[PDB]
Amino acid sequence: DDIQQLLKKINELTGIKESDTGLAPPALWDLAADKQTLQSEQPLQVARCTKIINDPKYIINVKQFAKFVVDLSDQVAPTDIEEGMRVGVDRN
Amino acid sequence: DLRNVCTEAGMFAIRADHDFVVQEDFMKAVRKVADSKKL
Amino acid sequence: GSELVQKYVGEGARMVRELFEMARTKKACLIFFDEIDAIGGARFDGGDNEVQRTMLELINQLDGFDPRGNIKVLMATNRPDTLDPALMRPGRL
Amino acid sequence: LNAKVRLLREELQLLQEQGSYVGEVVRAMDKKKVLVKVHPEGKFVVDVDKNIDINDVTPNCRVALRNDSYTLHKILPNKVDPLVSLMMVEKVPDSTYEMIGG
Amino acid sequence: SKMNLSEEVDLEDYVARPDKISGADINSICQESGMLAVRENRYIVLAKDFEKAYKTVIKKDEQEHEFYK
Amino acid sequence: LQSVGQIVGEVLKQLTEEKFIVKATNGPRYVVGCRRQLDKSKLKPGTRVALDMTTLTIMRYLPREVDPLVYNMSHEDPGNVSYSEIGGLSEQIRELREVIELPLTNPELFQRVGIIPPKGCLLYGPPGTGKTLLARAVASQLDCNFLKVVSSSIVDKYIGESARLIREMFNYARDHQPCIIFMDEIDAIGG
Amino acid sequence: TKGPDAASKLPLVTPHTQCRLKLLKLERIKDYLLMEEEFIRNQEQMKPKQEEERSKVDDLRGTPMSVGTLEEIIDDNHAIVSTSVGSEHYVSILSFVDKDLLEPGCSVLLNHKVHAVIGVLMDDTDPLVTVMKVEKAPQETYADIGGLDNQIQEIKESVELPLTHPEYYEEMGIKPPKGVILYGPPGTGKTLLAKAVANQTSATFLRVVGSELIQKYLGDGPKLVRELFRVAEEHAPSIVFIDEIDAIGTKRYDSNSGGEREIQRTMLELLNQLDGFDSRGDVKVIMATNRIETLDPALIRPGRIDRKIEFPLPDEKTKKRIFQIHTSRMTLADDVTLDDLIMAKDDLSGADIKAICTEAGLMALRERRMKVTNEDFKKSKENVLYKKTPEGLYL
Amino acid sequence: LRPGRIDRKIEFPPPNEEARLDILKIHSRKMNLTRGINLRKIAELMPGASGAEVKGVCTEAGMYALRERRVHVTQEDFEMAVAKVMQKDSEKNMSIKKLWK
Amino acid sequence: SGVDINTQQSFEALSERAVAVVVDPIQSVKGKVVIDAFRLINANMMVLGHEPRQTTSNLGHLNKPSIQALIHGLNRHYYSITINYRKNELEQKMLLNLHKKSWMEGLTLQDYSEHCKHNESVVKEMLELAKNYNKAVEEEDKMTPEQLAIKNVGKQDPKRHLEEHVDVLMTSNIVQCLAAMLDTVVFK
Amino acid sequence: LVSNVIELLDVKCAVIKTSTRQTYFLPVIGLVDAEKLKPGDLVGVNKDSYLILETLPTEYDSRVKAMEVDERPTEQYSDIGGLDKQIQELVEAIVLPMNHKEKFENLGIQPPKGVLMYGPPGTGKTLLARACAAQTKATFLKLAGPQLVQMFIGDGAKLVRDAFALAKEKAPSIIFIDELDAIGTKRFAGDREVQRTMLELLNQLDGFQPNTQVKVIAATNRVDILDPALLRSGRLDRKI
Amino acid sequence: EFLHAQEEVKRIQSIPLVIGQFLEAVDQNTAIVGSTTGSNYYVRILSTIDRELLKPNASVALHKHSNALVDVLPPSSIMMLTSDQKPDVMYADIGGMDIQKQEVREAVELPLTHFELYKQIGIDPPRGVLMYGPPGCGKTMLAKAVAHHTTAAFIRVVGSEFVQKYLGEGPRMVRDVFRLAKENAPAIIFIDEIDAIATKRFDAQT
Ligand SMILES: Nc1ncnc2c1ncn2[C@@H]1O[C@H](COP(=O)(O)OP(=O)(O)OP(=O)(O)O)[C@@H](O)[C@H]1O
Ligand SMILES: Nc1ncnc2c1ncn2[C@@H]1O[C@H](COP(=O)(O)OP(=O)(O)OP(=O)(O)O)[C@@H](O)[C@H]1O
Ligand SMILES: Nc1ncnc2c1ncn2[C@@H]1O[C@H](COP(=O)(O)OP(=O)(O)O)[C@@H](O)[C@H]1O
Ligand SMILES: Nc1ncnc2c1ncn2[C@@H]1O[C@H](COP(=O)(O)OP(=O)(O)O)[C@@H](O)[C@H]1O
Ligand SMILES: Nc1ncnc2c1ncn2[C@@H]1O[C@H](COP(=O)(O)OP(=O)(O)O)[C@@H](O)[C@H]1O
Ligand SMILES: [Mg+2]
Ligand SMILES: [Mg+2]
Ligand SMILES: [Mg+2]
Ligand SMILES: [Zn+2]
């Protein structure tokens, strides 16, 4: 009985089996600028411009979320965006 | 059968500009349908 | 075959559609369906339904409107008697 | 009277805090991180509270996660299928051995 | 009891008949008697329509194909 | 512009005079209360209401939205189709009139004689020879709703269609002018 | 690589009888356990760099970390990940992430707020599969099996000898049998042999029942089978024990029901994993059934099941061996001749021989005796066996 | 049914005369039996009965007293209950009975 | 939020003490009014000095910042300012009129029908509760009585469902009788 | 936020179902005119106020636009052998009422609304459909049954609605729903979604003004599977 | 201050509450509730709620924001014959079934009202009645009369209702009916035309 108890105690004391995660070698990243891109770059929901409206307006399908009528930001030009292609949109 | 033969006589009349259906046309329609129903 | 059979409704037919689209983008694609009897079972009347819908999607992709293109399909099964006659038709197989 | 009033006040305060999420544990990943599955949001790698020992966070246990950080803060009773839960006798039948003859 | 009936109808005449008929058959007999009385634009049920309804409901053999018996 | 939308829900139950149970169409169920100057009797179980989006209080009631299944079970046809349209069935229309007119016109004699129910009826014959027009010929007098629920939605093999598929016939007929459930070809019910 | 995850077990104690040598062996095992406990307890306490890097990575990651699926890789530092709700986000890939293992379909780790990829969930095993893995090996060894020498030899040459001595197979030019089925009457030693195999094997052992392979939802059955075989492949030397294969291995037929066709689909996925496109790998499959004639021919065909090991009802010698094994712990009498019970007509199975011993012990307890006798054994036999035969036709 | 799964098969044969008497005394313990109650004769009057039928006999003997609006049961009530509960259904057609000689 | 920080910066441009107030009208649905005053923390001061706020007294540490604000950035980019309500007379006596209970309700006799029904209902439920109290007292099980005194606490029979109902009945009856005597004296 | 007006009711008030699958009542219409609105129109409401800000032009899904025939496959009727009666029926029920119309009204004969080509596989159903697309100037609108089956609730009904609307926009438009068995199964939770798609198809078939300029062709190898409510009298009748 | 605290306790339940399902109580002052928004929550129970109403699965009202359980909502299913759904067949409407009437009543109406006589004799009144005979003799009419004349919940099912497709749904419906009768007891279950599922059990091979 006490051998069983010791086995359980050893297992509970170690009990980690550290799960591997995609962590690069320390020399590979060594970047404090990861915080810079985390704060500066914003995530963008992907959506396909179903219909173009002619300041042009754009109807976007955010997969299952919803349909919105949006406009491009100043970064991209109207020529780049075409009907039916998937584009990234900010969450706000 | 009567409704369909009425429609089928007109359907016969679609060929050529016939805006009216003749007695021969009704006869063709019935001798078509009443025999086609057997199949 | 497991991927073509998806939990959600309409997803297997969608997967078949994207698979055939991807084959069409390439030149002279070769598609292999091993154990086609997993999804190519004969229709009946809910049963599979969704699996039958996926099989119908594959059927109309193989033959029908919108010619398939340079896509030679390959199918293998040890129980061909359970296949849908539409799928076994000599325009698809 | 002071005890009564204080008890009511702490009940109010503990009622104002939000309800914590309920999630099953896929597996414990670290000595301080657990891979849980919150329904229906999905799977999360959550941190453990200081009052919960990681060694009691066994796979497939129902842990409680705080409303904000999804922090594992209670071990909770395990999940039983509702149809299987009614199978356990809670009120024993009144038949006794002396009621069986022959 | 709920039916209008008539003075001339005597239910004991129909009760004493040897025919073996269930309570559903009794209800059907009475309903057919009412229907027969109503068909002739009569608000009273008499012996004749009750008798005809009895005879109609009693006939239950239908075909039986004449050789099973 | 200042106006804001209001969520749409059904009053499932009446908790108290000032407490209601409402289910949002694609939301959760909320316990809510009425606004104030609303006739609480209009809020039966099943009615459509417009909850406020912030306090969730019932603000106004709404007509029901026409349901799917009910397209041939609720449509009314108070038309006048003469018996000349359905030709060659004078005896059958006479018999149909003798069956339907007498109970509909004067049920007082029927309750006087005692026999209440005249239900039943049966029009077996060749298929598609004018069975529907027979009940459409009788539509000369009244018979407004005139539902057609052929071989479906009343039995479904064992019981499957019942209550909500056995009683709504009699509800939507009663809340309107007389009609004919007219179930059809019952030889193919559940098959 | 991710080598085999062999089940842990303590060294076996030989004396069995409660003598002093057994006590000494158990005390030695306890002493080593105490030494290990003391060492791994004084390690962290006696212990008084990378902390800065770990802290920086943890603050950058934040908590909680959502688990999503990587859909596409656009740039070296940008990707489209789909959250568990099905909505895809165009997120940024942080530097402290391996771009090598970042592949489409993998389970990525995302920031809760920004959703940037901050790690990859490596294991991500279905919890319904990780339960199948054997962690505590059963205590039944090959010494617990009476007779079945040919069956033991075949099962060893199939699952144990290839791992222990692959040189014979390499020199011979033959690939060792990668599939075996154990069939026979119930209570003969199929599950016993599988338990002994798991006890002796150094490979990872996965045990299923063939009824947990069936899932309520449509695609979850074949997906579960694929996940199980992927896990078996991850730990290169693996043994998969599918007990009661009759549950899903039943012969394929045209069925007008979604459930039966889905179960046939699950079996088809099983036998596509067994032998189909792509090699199966160093995964050996053991299947058990009481009714092999009801199994689909494609499932038990050579290439999937290479050795159809038969498990007949024990004969006189095997019955004697099973009685010797199952009466070893019992304090037997002197007048007890087991040969009278060993004779039988034709239908004493190994499971029955153990119930006979248990019932004999119970009858001894009834008479307040801890030493079973012959009358106890005959009463136990005529008490425990339940039967079901031709009449006096043949001469 | 193999040993290891069902180790012991315990059979419940229909109660014998003494077993039936025991069941009768068990299910008539709360009943106000008259002085001339001989429960053994009731056991003999129930050959090849089951425990449920023995209890049904007591129940029907009590229901006879209920019908007569009394709280005590007599031997006659038990005897009539024996007949009412243990009433079997036979072939009813001597044609079928006489197929087998 | 970030935009809130930007507009607060725009406001501080005019005056260094431009305070922002955030109000939650749905969270402040009851006697709790959830309001807060925020001003930005100069991120340069975060390293140039330490904390932005001197603690020269104990008047600022009597509050406890809410976890939502710390998650959203309290004490890292904005700092809370304690909320003080400047309420005075002629602004408090006016708000006591929203429920003022004009003199009529102080002399209304209710109605005797539902008063009698309420009295009867409370008396019946009190008879049942007195049966329960009688049981609870005669049981007097002495197997560690201090423990049965704590194993049966459920807001039940002994005292809570007890005289509290006596309190309600006595208060209602006394008030009704006193009002009846008052109106039979004052009115003719 | 794009939304649809599921109904319009007098107090001037509208019930809007947003693209987020939730319906809100609007105490006021918004910035547009209630008269220039009806059930089913696409309107861009506010994200949070949910108030209509402007009306939106008829928007067709990418799948619906891809459904239109642009390559115009070349298959003469000479390539079809053994089906002369069937070709004549199809051309006289789907093409002849199209480019003639007014004279069909002149005889006062109702041209059937839809055609169901049914038979054993390989009999030439889809071949005849492709030939009809070849030798007609109408805007062919091909599709399949499995296409109108999607995960999201109401997506199949929306798909068939946009298909029929695009068919309406082009005056000479033909809809070919190949492999009708996928959605035409007998009435029996993806079953609910498939049923919603089927009833939406029935509603679109019934909503046609009689002898309109849009004809529907459907093909099926299994008719016993097909729901009997599909055939009926106003819907597909010519079971070729 | 105590009065103010009681008022706040009352104000905790102040109308806009989300209905939730009670899954299981972790311990006193705490429970796991399933909000009808679709996600499970670990919440705190107000002490003022009477604990015996927390059934293993009962409809409870949750605070809109804190999600805490603050109230328990009060509870036709398959038939559950309602007061307005009574068959309205009186015993007088039945013509001359005195033996059958008395035998049926002594088992299905007397125990519910006059249980004292059964206790005095101590006989465990009969729980099951089988009415049989030629069709149209008045069995279902007598069951209707019992339904109209009883103070207990009446459940009316047909033996053919139990025979369904989707194996495990027939016995599921049988168990549902009996559990429904258990919940609101006393109750009467009438299984008409049970002869469908009543045949002598033989060695079924399909
Ligand atoms: N040859 C044998 N030698 C020793 N013990 C045996 C032998 N055969 C069976 N037994 C005993 O019988 C018990 C039950 O048998 P086992 O678990 O092997 O069944 P099985 O062959 O898998 O059949 P089933 O799956 O139908 O139960 C084992 O635990 C073991 O103790
Ligand atoms: N009557 C016919 N005359 C000429 N070619 C034919 C005929 N019937 C079929 N074919 C040819 O045989 C093939 C049959 O495919 P088709 O698309 O016509 O099938 P279908 O009748 O629509 O059936 P399914 O939907 O089951 O595939 C085609 O390649 C077509 O050219
Ligand atoms: N004794 C009776 N008194 C009055 N009506 C009866 C009697 N017996 C039968 N009926 C009538 O016969 C019909 C058949 O009764 P019911 O019990 O439903 O059929 P079954 O006996 O086959 O179950 C009932 O509608 C009832 O009105
Ligand atoms: N005698 C008739 N006179 C006029 N129209 C008829 C006649 N018989 C059949 N019809 C036609 O048949 C159709 C009705 O068929 P119906 O008899 O209702 O079929 P079913 O009985 O299968 O429902 C109507 O459209 C009608 O035009
Ligand atoms: N040996 C017995 N002694 C006393 N009462 C018995 C005995 N056997 C049966 N009974 C009575 O008869 C009834 C038998 O029902 P039950 O034992 O549930 O049937 P089964 O054995 O077929 O499951 C019980 O209510 C019990 O009170
Ligand atoms: Mg086994
Ligand atoms: Mg085709
Ligand atoms: Mg009946
Ligand atoms: Zn803000």
DSSP state, residue G159: I
Q: Which of G148, G149, G188 to mutate to test ligand 1, by most ligand atoms within 8 A of the CB atom?
A: G188
I167 assigned binding-site residue: no
Does J146 contact C89 at a Cβ distance shorter than 8 Å? no
C-alpha J180/C-alpha J221 separation (Å) is 9
Which residue spans within D1-102 are E strands per DSSP? 20-28, 33-38, 42-47, 62-65, 72-74
3-state secondary structure chain K: CHHHHHHHHHHHCCCCEEEEEEEEEEECCEEEEEECCCCEEEECECCCCCHHHCCCCCEEEECCCCCCEEEECCCCCCCCCCHHHCCCCCCCCCCCCHHHHHHHHHHHCHHHHCHHHHHHHCCCCCCCCCCCCCCCCCHHHHHHHHHHHCCCEEEEEEHHHHCCCCCCCHHHHHHHHHHHHHHCCCEEEEEECCCHHHCCCCCCCC
Residues G359, G380 contacting (CB under 8 angstroms): yes
Chains J and I lie in contact, requiring 3 or more CB pairs less than 8 Å apart: no
Which residue spans within chain H are E strands per DSSP? 32-33, 72-73
In chain K, what residues touch H58 (CB-CB under 8 Å)? 123
Q: Which of H1, H8, H9, H10 to probe by mutation at the G interface, max G CB count within 10 Å?
A: H8
First to last CA, chain A: 62
Residue J147 φ then ψ, to 5°: -65, -40
Residues A62, A45 contacting (CB under 8 angstroms): yes
In chain G, what residues touch H1 (CB-CB under 8 Å)? 386
Q: Is the peptide bond before K16 cis (omega within 30 degrees of 0)?
A: no
Q: Is I67 at the interface with chain D, CB within 8 A? A: yes
C-alpha D96/C-alpha I39 separation (Å) is 75
> Given CA atoms G24, G25, G26, G28 in this order, what sign does their dihedral have?
positive
> Given CA atoms A22, A23, A28, A34 in this order, what sign does their dihedral have?
positive
* CA A11 and chain centroid, separation: 37
Strands K153-158 and K187-192: parallel
Residues F185, F153 contacting (CB under 8 angstroms): no
CB neighbours of G4 closer than 8 A, spacing ≥ 6?
A: G202, G203, G204, G235, G236, G237, G238
Strands D42-47 and F6-14: unpaired
**Helix or strand or coil: residue F62?**
strand
Binding residues of K: 133-140
This structure's resolution (Å) is 2.8
Distance from CA of H89 to the nearest CA of K (A): 14
Residues G324, G146 contacting (CB under 8 angstroms): yes
Residues G312, G184 contacting (CB under 8 angstroms): yes
C-alpha G209/C-alpha G224 separation (Å) is 13
Residue type, F82: S
Does K15 contact F32 at a Cβ distance shorter than 8 Å? yes
C-alpha H29/C-alpha G328 separation (Å) is 51
**Helix or strand or coil: residue G243?**
coil
What tokens appear for J7 in the block?
């109904």
Report the candidate in G345, G344, G330 with the shortest Cα–Cα distance to residue G376.
G330
C-alpha G280/C-alpha G176 separation (Å) is 13
Q: Is the peptide bond before K134 cis (omega within 30 degrees of 0)?
A: no
Nearest to J26 among F5, F63, F151 (CB): F5
Residues K11, I30 contacting (CB under 8 angstroms): yes
Nearest residue of K to residue H72, measured between CA atoms: K121
Q: Which helix (H) or strand (E) holds H83?
A: helix H75-85
Residue F143 φ then ψ, to 5°: 60, 70
Q: Is the CB of G350 under 6 A from ligand 1?
A: yes
Does D29 contact A15 at a Cβ distance shorter than 8 Å? no
Residue type, F156: D
What tokens appear for G143 in the block?
């010494």
Residues D18, K66 contacting (CB under 8 angstroms): yes
Nearest residue of K to residue D18, measured between CA atoms: K66
Residue type, G329: R
Residues J16, J26 contacting (CB under 8 angstroms): yes
Which residue reads 């399908």 in tokens?
A61
Does D101 contact H16 at a Cβ distance shorter than 8 Å? no
Residues J19, J31 contacting (CB under 8 angstroms): no
Report the candidate in F64, F60, F52, F51 with the shortest Cα–Cα distance to residue F23.
F51
DSSP result, J53-96: EEE------HHHHHHB--S-----GGG--S-SHHHHHHIIIIIH
Residue type, G342: I
Enumerate the H helices of A1-92 as residue ranges: 2-14, 26-29, 33-40
The residues pairing with D37 across neighbouring beta strands, listed in sequence order, are D24, D43
Strands A44-53 and D72-74: unpaired
**Helix or strand or coil: residue C74?**
strand
CB neighbours of G286 closer than 8 A, spacing ≥ 6?
A: G155, G159, G179, G180, G181, G182, G194, G197, G239, G240, G241, G242
Report the candidate in J215, J123, J226 with the shortest Cα–Cα distance to residue J182.
J226
- Which residues place a Cβ less than 5 A from the ion ligand 9? I 1, 4
Residue type, G376: D
What is the CA(K140)–ligand 3 centre distance, in A? 7
Enumerate the H helices of chain F as residue ranges: 90-105, 107-113, 131-137, 168-174
Residues A35, G42 contacting (CB under 8 angstroms): no
C-alpha F115/C-alpha H30 separation (Å) is 53
* Method for this entry: cryo-EM
What tokens appear for I88 in the block?
């005075």
C-alpha E52/C-alpha E39 separation (Å) is 13
J210 assigned binding-site residue: no
Q: Is D30 at the interface with chain A, CB within 8 A? A: yes
Report the candidate in C92, C72, C69, C93 with the shortest Cα–Cα distance to residue C30.
C72
> Given CA atoms K140, K142, K144, K150 in this order, what sign does their dihedral have?
negative
Burial of G277 (0-12, 13-18, 19+ CB in 10 A): exposed
C-alpha I83/C-alpha K18 separation (Å) is 32
Report the candidate in F71, E54, K23, K132 with the shortest Cα–Cα distance to residue J234.
F71
DSSP result, J118-157: E-STTSSHHHHHHHHHHT--SEEEEEETGGG--SSTTHHH
C-alpha H38/C-alpha H83 separation (Å) is 16
Residue J173 φ then ψ, to 5°: -125, 135
Residues K181, K81 contacting (CB under 8 angstroms): no
Chain breaks in chain G (C to N over 2.5 A) after: 48, 388
Q: Identify the nearest ligand to the CA of K134 by its number.
A: 3
Report the candidate in J38, J166, F22 with the shortest Cα–Cα distance to residue J16.
J38
**Helix or strand or coil: residue C54?**
helix
Residue K92 φ then ψ, to 5°: -65, -35
Radius of gyration, CA atoms only, chain C: 13
Q: Which of F129, F147, F152, F180 to mutate to test ligand 4, by most ligand atoms within 8 A of the CB atom?
A: F129
Residue G67, number of CB atoms within 10 A of its CB: 22
Residues J181, C56 contacting (CB under 8 angstroms): yes
CB neighbours of J53 closer than 8 A, spacing ≥ 6?
A: J30, J31, J32, J43, J44, J45, J46
Chains B and G lie in contact, requiring 3 or more CB pairs less than 8 Å apart: no
Residue I91 φ then ψ, to 5°: -120, -15
Q: Is H51 at the interface with chain D, CB within 8 A? A: yes
3-state helix, strand, coil in chain C (%, to 5): 35, 15, 50
**Helix or strand or coil: residue G132?**
coil
DSSP state, residue E64: G
What tokens appear for J207 in the block?
């909503």
Enumerate the H helices of D1-102 as residue ranges: 2-16, 82-85
Radius of gyration, CA atoms only, chain H: 18
Residue type, K128: G
Q: Which of A53, A67, A68 to probe by mutation at the J interface, max J CB count within 10 Å?
A: A67
